[PDB]
Each structure stands twice: as structure tokens, then as C-alpha cells.
From TrEMBL:
Disulfide bonds join 21-116, 26-54, 57-142, 87-96, 158-172. It holds the Pfam family EXPB1_D1. The gene is egv. CDD domains: DPBB_GH45_endoglucanase (cd22278). It comes from Phanerodontia chrysosporium (White-rot fungus). The keyword Signal applies. Keywords: Signal. The keyword Signal applies. InterPro entries: Expansin/allergen_DPBB_dom, RlpA-like_sf. Residues 23-147 form the Expansin-like EG45 domain. It comes from the Eukaryota. This is Endoglucanase V-like protein.
């Protein structure tokens, strides 16, 4: 995509959870289920504002624990998140360290979603004791996503991906060059 980001509507991803997503990198939080996406897909860098993932909605289905490959479940439910945040390469090498030089993470996944705990998504997705999963993502209309957006945290904040056609398309737009 512009900047050399790797952005596509469907594919394989790994998944983790995080807390404290009230001041996310797109510049608006939201009350529904939300995630951070790895930098190479987010479309921006720390300190550069919103990338083109911002506001887009994705159906996530987890089905495997890569740290316990013979665990057969239970896993969680399919959930629809809105991307509000960035999982940067720096400080997240295992899961979010995809670059144009090395486009998969340690789990061989070209995308990663870090699902925020604060608004309930991670509780629906991860079973107790299995907070890192793999599975798939499928971009969907945000009609599939419950909730509403928070106010603007700063001028330039953007969640306009929430109305866009699926990738390939441009809404908030990418910033800078993808990490290398």
C-alpha cells in the first residue's frame, strides 16, 4: 500500500490482549471492541498520527495456541473489532515486529491484532490461560461492530476507515514509510 505498508482485507494473524486503550494512535477511542494492529498494517509510526487501518472493522477468529499446539480448546468466539490503535515494532518484536525486510512475526504471521481488554473484546476472544492465539482476520463492514466512537483526542485524529470499502481503498491514509 502507499508507504510500503502491507494491508489486505483477509488473512492469517496472531492475537494478544492489552489494557489501556483510551488514548490510541488513531486519536479516537471507541466503546465497542477495539484492537491495535501491527505497524506494517497500521500504516503509520509512533508519533505520526492515524494510518489507513484506523476505523476499519475486522471479524477475528482464533483457533490455535502456538505455545500449546496440542491444546484443542475451548477457544473463544468470533468477534468484530474496530482498529483504533497501533502495535508498534519497537517494544513488540515477537508479535508486531513485521517489517518490509522481514514481513512475518515470530509466529510466521503477516498480521497481528492486539485486542483491548477495556471494552470487553479480549474476554470474548481468549480463553483463560491462553492469551496468545493464531487464526484469521476478515475485514467486514462496521455494521457488524457494536458501539460508537469517542471524541477527538487531537487535531488530525481519524477513524474514517469505518465507512470505507474494504482494502484496497484509502480512508485516513498512510503516513511515512513502512518499517524496514
Amino acid at each position: 500500500a502507499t508507504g510500503g505498508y502491507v494491508q489486505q482485507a483477509t488473512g492469517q494473524a496472531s492475537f494478544t490482549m492489552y489494557s489501556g486503550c483510551g488514548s490510541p494512535a488513531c486519536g479516537k477511542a471507541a466503546s465497542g471492541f477495539t484492537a491495535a494492529i501491527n505497524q506494517l498494517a497500521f500504516g503509520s509510526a509512533p508519533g505520526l498520527g492515524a494510518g489507513d487501518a484506523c476505523g476499519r472493522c475486522f471479524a477475528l477468529t482464533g483457533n490455535h495456541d502456538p505455545y500449546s499446539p496440542n491444546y484443542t480448546g475451548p477457544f473463544g468466539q468470533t468477534i468484530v473489532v474496530k482498529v483504533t490503535d497501533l502495535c508498534p515494532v519497537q517494544g513488540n518484536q515477537e508479535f508486531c515486529g513485521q517489517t518490509t525486510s522481514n514481513p512475518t512475526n515470530q509466529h510466521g504471521m503477516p498480521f497481528h491484532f492486539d485486542i483491548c481488554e477495556d471494552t470487553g473484546g479480549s474476554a470474548k476472544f481468549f480463553p483463560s490461560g491462553h492469551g496468545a492465539l493464531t487464526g484469521t482476520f476478515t475485514e467486514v463492514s462496521c455494521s457488524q461492530w457494536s458501539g460508537s466512537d469517542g471524541g477527538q483526542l487531537w487535531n488530525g485524529a481519524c477513524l474514517s476507515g469505518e465507512t470505507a470499502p474494504n482494502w484496497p481503498s484509502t480512508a485516513c491514509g498512510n503516513k511515512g514509510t513502512a518499517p524496514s
